[PDB]
Amino acid sequence: PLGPKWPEPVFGRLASPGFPGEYANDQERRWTLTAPPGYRLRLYFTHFDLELSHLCEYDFVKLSSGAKVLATLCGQESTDTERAPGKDTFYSLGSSLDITFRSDYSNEKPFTGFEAFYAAEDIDECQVAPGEAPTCDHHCHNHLGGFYCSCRAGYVLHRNKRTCSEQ
Amino acid sequence: LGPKWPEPVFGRLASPGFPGEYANDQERRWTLTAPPGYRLRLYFTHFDLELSHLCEYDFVKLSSGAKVLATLCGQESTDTERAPGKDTFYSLGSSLDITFRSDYSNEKPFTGFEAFYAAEDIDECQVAPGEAPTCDHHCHNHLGGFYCSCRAGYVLHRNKRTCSEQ
Ligand SMILES: [Ca+2]
Ligand SMILES: [Ca+2]
Ligand SMILES: [Ca+2]
Ligand SMILES: [Ca+2]
Numbered sequence: 001p002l003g004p005k006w007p008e009p010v011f012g013r014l015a016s017p018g019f020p021g022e023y024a025n026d027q028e029r030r031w032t033l034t035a036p037p038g039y040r041l042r043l044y045f046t047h048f049d050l051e052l053s054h055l056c057e058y059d060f061v062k063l064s065s066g067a068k069v070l071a072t073l074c075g076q077e078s079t080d081t082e083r084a085p086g087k088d089t090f091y092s093l094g095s096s097l098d099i100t101f102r103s104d105y106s107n108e109k110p111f112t113g114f115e116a117f118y119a120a121e122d123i124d125e126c127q128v129a130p131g132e133a134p135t136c137d138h139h140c141h142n143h144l145g146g147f148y149c150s151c152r153a154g155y156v157l158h159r160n161k162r163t164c165s166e167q
Numbered sequence: 168l169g170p171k172w173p174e175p176v177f178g179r180l181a182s183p184g185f186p187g188e189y190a191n192d193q194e195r196r197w198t199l200t201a202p203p204g205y206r207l208r209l210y211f212t213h214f215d216l217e218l219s220h221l222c223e224y225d226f227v228k229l230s231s232g233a234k235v236l237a238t239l240c241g242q243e244s245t246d247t248e249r250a251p252g253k254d255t256f257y258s259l260g261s262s263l264d265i266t267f268r269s270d271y272s273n274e275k276p277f278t279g280f281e282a283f284y285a286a287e288d289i290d291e292c293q294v295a296p297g298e299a300p301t302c303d304h305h306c307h308n309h310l311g312g313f314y315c316s317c318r319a320g321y322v323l324h325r326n327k328r329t330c331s332e333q
Contacts, residue, residue: 004175006202007288008168011309020319046305047319112319119309122287139212143177143285144205144310150179153186153213153278 007144010035010120016101016113020047023113027103034096035120038145041092043099043118045085048077049111051104056083059107061114062100065092076111095120138164170202170311176286182267182279186213189279191272199263201286204311207258209265209284211251215277216240217269221247224270227280231259251280304330 014031016023035041043063051059056074060083063070070090075081090097097118125147126140134140136149151157151164158165180197182189199207209229217225222240229236236256237249244250263284291313292306300306302315317323317330324331 003171003173006169006172006176007310009309009311011307046316115319117305117307117316119307121310139283141177141283141285144287145176150212150283153281 007039007120007122008036010039010041012118014099014114014116014118016103016115019113019115021112022107022110023103025103025105025107027101029101031099032096033092033099033118035092036145037095038123038125039095039120040123041095041097041118042121043090043097043116044087045073045114045116047112047115048073048075048085049113050074050076051107051109051111052076052079052081052083058104059111060102061085062102063090064098064100065096066094068093073114135162137162172202174200176201178284180265180282180284182216182281185279185281187278188273188276189269191269194266194268196267197265199258199265199284201261202311203261204289204291205286206261206289207263207284208287209256209258209263209282210253211280211282213278213281214239214251215242215279217273217275217277218242218248222249225273225277226266226268227251228266228268229256229263230266231257231263234259302328 012033017027017029018024033041052075053059056072059074061073073083073085075083077084122144124142126135126142128135138152138155139150141148141150149157149162154167155164156167183193183195184190201207216227218241222238225240227239239249239251241248241250288310290308292301292308294301304318304321305316307314307316315323315328320332321330322333
């Protein structure tokens with residue numbers, strides 16, 4: 001028998017150029033991260049020190065999953081402003097994550113940049129928000145990389161893979 | 168990547184002849200084991216077995232290594248007689264084996280049980296309060312493992328946990 005395909009350990013690290021040193025001006029960097037289907041990406045910062053800007057129009061770290069923009073980060077973790085990431089965790093809405101670091105023409109002070117880490121994790125597609133239709137008619141089974149439905153005794157799974165019909 | 172392994176990441180277990188009446192004098196055992204790091208989560212969707220004091224006649228024993236996680240029988244729980252309900256069970260580590268034993272006979276036509284299990288990554292970065300952190304500075308959990316990192320300015324010691332200037 002062809003052995004069961006297990007999870008690839010997709011995880012990594014991102015850091016501003018020259019981290020932990022000052023980061024040059026007018027820098028531009030982009031990273032594209034993806035996890036296997038059935039897996040989302042979790043990312044968080046261990047270090048965040050950028051030029052503070054009212055709407056991060058100067059220096060910044062933008063996180064994006066597809067169209068939606070997860071947040072535009074900037075500012076120092078030391079001053080604990082509102083633009084900084086802090087310890088928040090970020091997740092990709094699909095299985096993709098796009099990160100961009102943007103350094104403008106000059107720095108008020110010697111900002112040390114940022115360091116981030118990410119890791120693929122299993123999406124529990126059995127998880128649904130309060131008041132939303134349950135992912136399965138009868139029973140929901142989540143496993144690594146996917147999920148499936150099952151029926152109570154006396155019933156049988158419909159061709160649609162969710163509906164349970166009496167038998 | 169993906170750690171090569173014989174057993175599937177998930178599966179289903181059911182008493183003989185489920186959902187019908189399970190034969191008498193039957194004893195079956197299952198061995199569930201996943202790759203290093205991961206652990207197994209198992210739960211029952213259906214549980215209908217003969218009742219008995221300390222589940223002596225018929226039973227479903229869930230053990231992980233040496234420690235016996237729990238023994239089950241009946242349809243409901245009493246004192247010294249535990250019934251699964253919707254509760255969840257986890258393998259201490261990466262190993263979990265099940266045993267279903269039926270004795271000579273049954274008064275009522277018991278339909279047995281159905282169970283499902285799935286492997287899930289362990290968050291070794293997670294620890295029971297009081298215990299020291301797995302890492303001195305930063306803990307990174309990922310599928311199948313983990314590793315530590317240090318604050319800027321510090322470097323990780325040979326032990327891959329403690330951090331120090333330089
Ligand atoms: Ca600047
Ligand atoms: Ca899943
Ligand atoms: Ca019996
Ligand atoms: Ca892990």
